[PDB]
Design a protein around this ligand. Structure first.
Ligand code: A1BQK
Ligand code: ZN
Length: 139
């Protein structure tokens, strides 16, 4: 579990979105596993606007932060799940690192701010849904 809070927005994994998130929907994309909903309170996360390929993520299943090198956002095949059929997930970045299903929502950050959130994993890999292209999150 986990979310990004920036301005009047809440960014979460689309497969973990709540009834409240869907009742206050701003935008959602199944191909990215992202959903953004509106909030009454003000968010203070800084979103990174960069092409960094190194950063640090939070891994809830270990209660620890890990440094990682990660790939550029791209279309990566993801096996079928209870939430989606087998498909290519777009805007996804992979890294070598520990992850378990409950790790989704953990933030990945570089020196510039929030890069994205854990969205996939398995076999010593961890996948992050990128958020750096969503320029509208700031205004
Ligand atoms: N974006 C998707 O389509 C997700 C939906 C839920 C399932 N999923 C996973 O990758 C499950 C998983 C296994 C093992 C380590 C994992 O770390 C994070 C997630 C995960 C794909
Ligand atoms: Zn950066």
């Amino acid at each position: 579990s986990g979310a990004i809070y920036v301005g009047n927005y809440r960014v979460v994994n689309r497969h973990l979105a709540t009834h409240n998130d869907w009742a206050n929907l701003v935008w959602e994309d199944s191909s990215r596993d992202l959903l953004v909903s509106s909030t009454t309170a003000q968010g203070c996360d800084t979103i990174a606007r960069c092409d960094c390929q190194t950063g640090v993520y939070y891994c809830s299943s270990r209660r620890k932060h890990y440094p990682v090198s990660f790939s550029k956002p791209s279309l990566i095949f993801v096996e079928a799940s209870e939430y989606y059929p087998a498909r290519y997930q777009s805007h996804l970045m992979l890294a070598v690192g520990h992850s378990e299903p409950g790790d989704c929502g953990g933030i990945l950050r570089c020196q510039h701010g929030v890069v994205g959130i854990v969205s996939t994993g398995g076999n010593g890999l961890v996948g992050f849904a990128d958020v750096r292209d969503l320029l509208w999150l700031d205004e």
